[PDB]
């Protein structure tokens, strides 16, 4: 799109929407671009704001040196626009202690290193210094005002005129020191971190200090990024700020009802989204991204797999700790989302199962092959058939009266003490969870009936396998009651099995039907043990008209029913 021009698209949401389609497309018989899909099509736009997460890969262009390393990105030509740099730092820094992550008695500073740029050439008297987290500006001529001179003042209303070093703490880097070091011997911006970040940190290149104060509260310390002019002196190498990042805008905006009568604006429909949460605790870029960032997709999928593996086969407080990192609404939103990548969807489903559906489901599956039945008056009120019409009836409905293990959960709290007995660290609202699962089962069945080109995530196996796994794990715990099970049955009886399915999907309703057969077996054994009491009572009564005993202890139940 050019400047001050407006365009429109119609990917094929409706046939009637397309204007000049009957002339050729309908006569020839060619379908539109988005006629098979049943979801809103998202797009990507080039970001006007330039991003700050780039490294030079294929751009256009003892202690010999303290830090002792080199890089290969030296500029040759075709650039004079004071580019802004960034290079990754997997290297160490000096030998004055280690401070673990990359009280210094008998020492001056630590982390002696430098992002070297040869300053002796002085192409345009470049500015050098640290910057804050946000420097999203690509103006060629700068340092006129350092973007802003932010300084918050608040007194009795004076005092407390706290100053902020806005977008950069970058020093002048001018002629500065009149020493005028021969060749490229003007410091090479050696870095020396001070023990305290409350006062100041030292990052200078001049032979003598003049002024770098910029008193700010502790903000950040991150990958090295400093400025350099662009000519051909071969200046910079470790001792970019490209704007070529397409950005997905959104799918559903927040509705606004701005109108007349005082320009009233109101909002009643809420909306939410999550953000990236990559390890080392510094990342937040959207959630519906990563469909085009393969490396981070793999890394986050492996992190989710690590979480699932750690919280597996029962764990006392690791589940509680992980519940702080991953809360209920985030899990519910990830389950509900129809645009999630398949890997992330499967990972979140498996994490949900492994923290909340693990212990009790495993215990119930262990006890499912015991068939222990008590002896109460309600146990006698069960029959093989519910009616004399010889109708088989639904398998799962009806009373069971079996000594199944009880369900016990806890609360996460995180401000309390002595909580390690668990099923899940919180308790989920299982009623609305069941409602969401049923509605998603119906939605998935309806979507698979039309055989879309675009499933919910990735493909049909990613759409179905985590969903069917969650449904099966909920079903093997007895959360379903009569009407919910009745509603579920008509999703398979007429059909889920009729439609064509892949093999990872086909593996799961085999387990479903196995559980149904197990329920039928339990019903059979309950009916048998119910009739057993009546038959044994009748036999004991019949043992009283032909009774026989010669023991001293007369009328012993050994005569009735007992061997010894």
């Amino acid at each position: 799109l050019g400047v001050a021009q407006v365009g429109r698209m119609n990917f094929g949401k409706d046939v009637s929407t397309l204007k000049y389609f009957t002339i050729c497309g309908l006569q020839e018989g060619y379908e539109p671009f988005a006629v098979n899909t049943n979801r809103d099509i998202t797009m990507w736009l080039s970001k006007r704001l330039p991003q700050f997460l780039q490294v030079p890969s294929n751009h256009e262009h003892s202690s010999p040196c303290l830090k002792v390393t080199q890089k290969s990105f030296g500029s040759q030509n075709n650039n004079t626009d004071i580019m802004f740099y960034r290079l990754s730092m997997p290297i160490e820094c000096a030998e004055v202690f280690s401070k673990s992550v990359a009280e210094y008695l008998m020492q001056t500073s630590t982390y002696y290193y430098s992002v070297r740029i040869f300053p002796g050439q002085e192409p345009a008297n470049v500015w050098v210094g640290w910057i804050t987290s946000d420097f999203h500006q690509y103006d060629t001529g700068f340092d006129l005002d350092r973007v802003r001179t932010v300084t918050v003042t608040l007194g009795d209303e004076v005092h407390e005129s706290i100053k902020r070093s806005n977008c950069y703490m970058v020093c002048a880097g001018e002629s500065m020191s009149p020493g005028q070091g021969r060749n490229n011997s003007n410091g090479l911006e050696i870095g020396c971190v001070v023990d305290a970040a409350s006062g100041l940190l030292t990052f200078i290149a001049n032979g003598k200090e003049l002024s770098t104060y910029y008193q700010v509260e502790p903000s950040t310390k991150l990958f090295p990024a400093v400025f350099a002019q662009a000519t051909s002196p071969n200046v910079f190498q470790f001792e970019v700020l490209w704007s070529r990042m397409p950005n997905q805008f959104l799918k559903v905006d927040v509705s606004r009802i701005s109108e007349r009568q005082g320009w009233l604006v109101q909002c009643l429909d809420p909306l939410q989204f999550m953000s990236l949460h990559i390890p080392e605790e510094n990342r937040s870029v959207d959630i519906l991204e990563l469909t085009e960032q393969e490396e981070l997709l793999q890394f986050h999928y492996h992190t989710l797999r690590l979480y699932s593996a750690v919280c597996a086969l029962g764990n006392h407080r690791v589940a509680h700790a992980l519940c702080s990192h991953v809360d209920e609404p985030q899990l519910l939103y990830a389950i509900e989302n129809k645009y999630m990548p398949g890997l992330l969807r499967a990972g979140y489903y498996d994490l949900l199962i492994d923290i909340h559906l693990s212990s009790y489901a495993t215990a119930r599956l262990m006890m499912n092959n015991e068939f222990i039945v008590p002896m109460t008056e309600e146990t006698k009120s069960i029959t093989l058939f519910p009616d004399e019409n010889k109708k088989h009836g639904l398998p799962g409905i009806g009373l069971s009266t079996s000594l199944r293990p009880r369900m016990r959960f806890s609360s996460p709290s995180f401000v309390s003490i002595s909580n390690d007995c668990y099923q899940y660290s919180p308790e989920f609202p299982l009623d609305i969870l069941k409602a969401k699962t049923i509605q998603m089962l119906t939605e998935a069945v309806k979507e698979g009936s039309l055989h879309a080109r675009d499933p919910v995530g990735g493909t049909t196996e990613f759409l179905f396998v985590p969903l069917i796994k969650l449904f099966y794990t909920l079903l093997i715990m007895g959360i379903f009651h009569n009407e919910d099970l009745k509603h579920i049955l008509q999703l398979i009886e007429p059909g889920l099995l009729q439609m064509k399915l892949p093999e990872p999907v086909k593996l799961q309703m085999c387990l479903l039907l196995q559980y149904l057969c197990d329920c039928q077996v339990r019903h059979r054994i309950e009916a048998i043990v119910a009739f057993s009491d009546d038959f044994v009572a009748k036999l004991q009564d019949n043992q009283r008209f032909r009774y026989n005993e010669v023991m001293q202890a007369l009328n012993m139940s050994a005569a009735l029913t007992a061997r010894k």
């Binding site: 407080r317 992980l322 209920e328 995180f414 401000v415 309390s416 003490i417 308790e427």
Partner: protein
């Protein structure tokens, strides 16, 4: 030392005494923009007890100056917090904490 900055005007006519039930809504908030606990999303109000060490004393220190229908920001020091060890798996050692504890009913 406790610093409480109110964001809702409490009545102040009533104070939480010793030995009456109370329902509490709060959202934990670690510094530097880190969220580690909440209750609105769980939809389960936190119910706890004043006066017999069943809970960390920072909540008592915050709620001592509050009243019915009052929401305020809570700040607590590491000594009144978990402190030198923290909770293994969530809270690093020697870390402060910030809360948005709110009082609904006192009975």
């Amino acid at each position: 030392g406790v610093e409480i900055e109110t964001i809702s005007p409490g009545d102040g006519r009533t104070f939480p005494k010793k030995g009456q039930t109370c329902v509490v809504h709060y959202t934990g908030m670690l510094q530097n923009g880190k969220k580690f606990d909440s209750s609105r999303d769980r939809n389960k109000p936190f119910k706890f007890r004043i006066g017999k060490q069943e809970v960390i004393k920072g909540f008592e220190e915050g709620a001592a100056q509050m009243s019915l229908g009052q929401r305020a920001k809570l700040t607590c020091t590491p000594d009144v917090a978990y402190g030198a060890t923290g909770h293994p798996g969530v809270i690093p050692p020697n870390a402060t904490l910030i809360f948005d504890v709110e009082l609904l009913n006192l009975e």
